[PDB]
Amino acid sequence: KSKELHAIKERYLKFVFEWDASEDTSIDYNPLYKERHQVQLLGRGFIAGIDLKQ
Amino acid sequence: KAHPPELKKFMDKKLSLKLNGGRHVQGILRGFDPFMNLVIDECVEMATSGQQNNIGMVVIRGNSIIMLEALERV
Amino acid sequence: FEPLVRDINLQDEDWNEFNDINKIIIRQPIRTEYKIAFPYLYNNLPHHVHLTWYHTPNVVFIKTEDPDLPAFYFDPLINPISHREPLPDDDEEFELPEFVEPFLKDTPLYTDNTANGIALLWAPRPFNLRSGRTRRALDIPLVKNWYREHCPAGQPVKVRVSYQKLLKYYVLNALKHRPPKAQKKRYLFRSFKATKFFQSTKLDWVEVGLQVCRQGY
Amino acid sequence: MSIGVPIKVLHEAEGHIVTCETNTGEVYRGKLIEAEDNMNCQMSNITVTYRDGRVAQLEQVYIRGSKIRFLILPDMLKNAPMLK
Amino acid sequence: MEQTLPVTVYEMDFLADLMDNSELIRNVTLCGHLHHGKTCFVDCLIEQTHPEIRKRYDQDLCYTDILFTEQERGVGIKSTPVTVVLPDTKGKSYLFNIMDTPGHVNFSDEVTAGLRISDGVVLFIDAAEGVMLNTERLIKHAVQERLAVTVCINKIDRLILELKLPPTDAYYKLRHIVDEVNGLISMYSTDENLILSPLLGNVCFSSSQYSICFTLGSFAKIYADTFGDINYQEFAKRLWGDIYFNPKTRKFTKKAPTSSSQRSFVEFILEPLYKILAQVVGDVDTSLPRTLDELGIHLTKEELKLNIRPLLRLVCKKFFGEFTGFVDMCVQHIPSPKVGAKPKIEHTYTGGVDSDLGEAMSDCDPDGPLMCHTTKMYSTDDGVQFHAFGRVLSGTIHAGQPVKVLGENYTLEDEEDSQICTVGRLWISVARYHIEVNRVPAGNWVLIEGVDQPIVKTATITEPRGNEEAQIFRPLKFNTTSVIKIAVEPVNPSELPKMLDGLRKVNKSYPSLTTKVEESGEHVILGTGELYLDCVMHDLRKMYSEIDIKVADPVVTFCETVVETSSLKCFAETPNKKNKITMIAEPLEKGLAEDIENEVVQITWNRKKLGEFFQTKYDWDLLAARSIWAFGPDATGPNILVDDTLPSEVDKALLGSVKDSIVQGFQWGTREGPLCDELIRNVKFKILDAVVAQEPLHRGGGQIIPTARRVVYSAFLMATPRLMEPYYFVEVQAPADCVSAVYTVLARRRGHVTQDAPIPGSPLYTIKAFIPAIDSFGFETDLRTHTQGQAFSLSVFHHWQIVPGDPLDKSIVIRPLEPQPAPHLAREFMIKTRRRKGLSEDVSISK
Amino acid sequence: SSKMLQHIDYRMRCILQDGRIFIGTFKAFDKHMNLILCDCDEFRKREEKRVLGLVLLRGENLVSMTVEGPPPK
Ligand SMILES: Nc1nc2c(ncn2[C@@H]2O[C@H](COP(=O)(O)OP(=O)(O)OP(=O)(O)O)[C@@H](O)[C@H]2O)c(=O)[nH]1
């Protein structure tokens, strides 16, 4: 709500080996763009890499 | 392979059928065969003499059939 | 990325009778995704806007689970079909000749490698192929399709920043890509072997590694 | 290998104007409605000329295929893909 | 002729000679839901009629999505005409004029433009998806425009390769699709002669990706060509429905022999196709050459080395061959221009079939008066000059022939809209290359050059010095209403004329585009949706005007209405203070406005039929039922004007002198509206007392019309005014798991879900919901992002509903940049729209 | 039957059962020997030529045929 209104107002008015966390994106206010519904792939497809049993 | 000739549009239809020896025949169609041998109801002879002679149930060899015309509108 | 070209800013456009914020009805904010999806509607001065690929029909592929089922089988994941015609009469004299049967009648409907052969249609490249040209070992990125996925929610911030940074260089490579220049085939090692100063053999890789280490030293 | 080209050309002639000359020397010019593998022609709007030269009008005609001497087809059929 | 063209299976001389015989021409439009396979078909046919133009192995050559944005978006945006000569099953050749129409619900105007100049419709339906939203909408539109309807169930391979249904269940799915189409047709049409069934040859089965296209007759002909002694026409009559084959008696019965017996369609058609596909995709190395030997297909060695998809395409192409089933369908069940001319003149000609010119047009005689109707305008890539496109309903158009072009406002008494022009060139339009010709007879489609100057949307091209009593064809009646509204303004005000010229050009391109200039000097574009306006602005900025254009926020068009009867009977007098009118305003009965707009009632009816209709349908007495004066701002506006003046109180003969002016005043007043200069909807205006000055020098003209408009406004303002939102109808297809996510996305935008239901034979679900148009911008993107792309939605305008708040309430305080609560949405929608229009800040409620 | 594919496109005169002569361009033939002759003219005996065009004659009345002119351009 407050971040909602603030976004509306804004729109209309050394060797660093590790990346700085300030460069992160996806720090969003809309709950639809944070809690994205996860694809289930009919319960038979799985994401690569992660352990299958998990 | 002898496909039946298409006369279903000429079904139940008053027709004039001319012949080999200059003969000509009139009536209504009731059926055919792949040899187009033709059955006629209410057949009328009307030979070249000019007098119409009626017979009725007749069946004609297709080998002598020259030309089929539907007098009534199809 | 960084700004492609210095231009006007969101704080640089003065109030006009056009863009007056008192004439604007706000229901839901115009997110950046809305401006990417329709670059010519939600955006002023669109340049270098590559139109995104619109919807692709949903591939309703039923992944098999048990190989002891028929290849063509009404899977429970498929919603049932609720049951409920100028046909000729039986007495109509139409008979099918003696030597006429459906085209492939002896051929079985499905073989023991039909379910697997269909699942290969939707396999990612190169598993949807059956022939091709060999690639170099270093030209095969095994994780390139890992970081092209969505940023994984719940991972620490370092992981997500790594994902985005990998995507940045991927996009830069795909964008700054230049055509390979035309040239005339000249090979260094063939030239070396042509001269009398070099000779060929066949050694273990470790031995050659030791030789290269000592030679560099 | 089964059905000859001229029968195919006659099939193409359906819908055009055709003139038909049967063994009795009778000329039938009219719109060809249908044709079969045999020369059985169902053809319409006939301007029919007899041997003596008398001309008549007859709206529907069906000619037995065995009893055609020759059939004159419209010239645009010379460009049929089947004639190449 | 004399134009370098791709080599064809036929020769263009044959094509030119076919155009003269109107009985061998088929004017067909391809329509269907989005991405239902309508475009390969065209190349899936261009390839079969163009040996050198082939589809790429890994990429489909759309060949009719010739546009830039069409090629990147992969979405049909504009109709593309294709003229090809296609052979029949019997070897006969017909000339086909095919209209490839876009399937997106936003671009329905292109579909109506195609439907106007077409005699038949081929509806494409995905075999897996089934009957979707646009399929129903296009069925309704086609049966309403009196077009022959045929169905092509495309993408049947999805039943085999994706869903992997058993052949019997694939048959059930196909029968269910056909039954759904039949039910829709019977719903939107009264006469029964449009029964769709593969037994009648109406329905074809196809898979354009793999070059499969067969009817029952074509497959029976494949059998006959293999085994000579069978009659394929009688065979085809037993290949559908609950008719089973008995191999012992070699006869087809209506009862299954014993048990485990399959229907004829499964045994003879579906099972062989299943086996072909299964062999190709599973046993290509093991047991493919043997089956190919059985079917008589011999593939060369380098041909068997192909990938599975090109190999399947090639095998099916060899087995099936040309698309003769499609041509059989369209020849048997789509009228030729000669036969279909009469319904076309009956429906789309203002003069009616009975007119003398109507008769000559209904004959479709190419030696008669010229009568060409153009509905599409195609711009050359330079974007300077356009080319009109339409069919020649009568006569014959020639290159270099001067013509008289009639606009949309041209009447037989106002002959000022007509303009003489000179035809420059004529092209027989094909998808990509234009084949220039010298003349085009009746019944054909022609691309005309030189008549683009005086036309905006549609035209009727006739001959000068003849055809004096030549009227026009009715302007296109579209499926939807343009609601989404955006404003445009050049970045540099110096180049305003350039943007105006570009606006004229885009108005020419898009049939349903409405560009208007508001009172405040604001240029406004009306569109159907986000994609529609996106592509409109893409064309405007890049194609027609090379300047930079600013775009305002999207907004919708509102409508104004009432909810009770006016408290005090309003009155208004002329400046002469002699003529006085008294009116009251009350809301119309439920469901009457829709009856009025949909031409269920017309004021052209005699007073008797009007009265009886109102009496039997809405409980009106004869006095009021026959008392109707006008029917809203247009001839079919959703408002009614009724006179309750008693014969004793006011002399009716004198009232007739001012009837013709009160009607105009009421029409203009409803056209403007007092709240925010929006249309008035669903309002009944009753006149109670009309004091008329006897002297005609005092009444009539510019004295009584403004009084009528003012009294209309004041009467409207007494009964509680309300605003009206356009409501969108959204259909969403999504898997079972993402249904809840769809609900969550909808709940945030004032959405109200009507129904979710499984798609029979598919693992997906259809969610149908209602969403306000204004609370819909980015809804598609929200739904496709929250669901990771697994849910897709198409939205179309449905109806008008009242905004929750009360527009006339000064107690509400609104901040400039915050979303408002529903209790006072109407107040914001009203004042902000007024500010946008440039009017005062608030209304002045008075008498 | 190469004995007549060799004769295609050649200007051919064919003799009919009733004595009619048909001169034209040989286009096509079938097993029943129905002939396709384009820009065909008929010669009857008193000399007279009647231009007819594309003639499809049934095999019944065809008797004898002979090359008269080389294929045109
Ligand atoms: N599985 C399958 N996919 C097909 C078939 N035919 C086409 N497609 C694909 O489905 C999509 C449909 O694209 P088009 O055929 O161009 O779409 P359209 O029907 O013209 O509709 P619009 O996008 O509105 O123009 C593309 O990805 C095609 O390659 C088919 O028979 N089977």
Numbering used by the authors:
A (entry chain D): 243 to 255, 271 to 311
B (entry chain n): 3 to 76
C (entry chain A): 279 to 362, 369 to 501
D (entry chain k): 1 to 84
E (entry chain C): 105 to 951
F (entry chain h): 6 to 50, 61 to 88
Copy the relevant paper text.
The 20S U5 small nuclear ribonucleoprotein particle (snRNP) is a 17-subunit RNA–protein complex and a precursor of the U4/U6.U5 tri-snRNP, the major building block of the precatalytic spliceosome. The 39-subunit U4/U6.U5 tri-snRNP is the largest preassembled building block of the spliceosome, which joins the splicing pathway at the precatalytic (pre-B) stage and delivers two components of the RNA catalytic core, the U5 and U6 snRNAs, in their inactive configurations requiring further remodeling. CD2BP2 is a hallmark protein of the 20S U5 snRNP, absent from the mature tri-snRNP. Here we report a high-resolution cryogenic electron microscopy structure of the 20S U5 snRNP, shedding light on the mutually exclusive interfaces utilized during tri-snRNP assembly and the role of the CD2BP2 in facilitating this process.
We determined a cryogenic electron microscopy (cryo-EM) structure of the CD2BP2-bound 20S U5 snRNP complex at the 3.1 Å resolution. In all reconstructions, PRP8 provides the scaffold for the entire complex and interacts with multiple other subunits. PRP6 is present in the sample, but only its N-terminal helices are visible, and the tetratricopeptide (TPR) repeat remains disordered. We observed two well-defined densities located near PRP8RT/En and PRP8Nterm domains, which were assigned to CD2BP2 domains D1 (62-130) and D2 (150-233), respectively. The CD2BP2GYF domain (280-341) and its binding partner DIM1 are not visible in our structure. A hook-shaped extension of the CD2BP2D1 bridges the PRP8RT/En and PRP8Nterm domains and probably stabilizes their relative orientation, which differs from the one observed in the tri-snRNP. Therefore, CD2BP2 constitutes a two-layered buffer blocking the DIM1–PRP8 interaction by simultaneously binding to the interfaces on both PRP8 and DIM1. Second, CD2BP2 acts as a placeholder preventing PRP8RT/En association with its numerous binding partners in a wrong spatiotemporal context. Our data shows that DIM1 competes with CD2BP2 for the same binding site on PRP8.
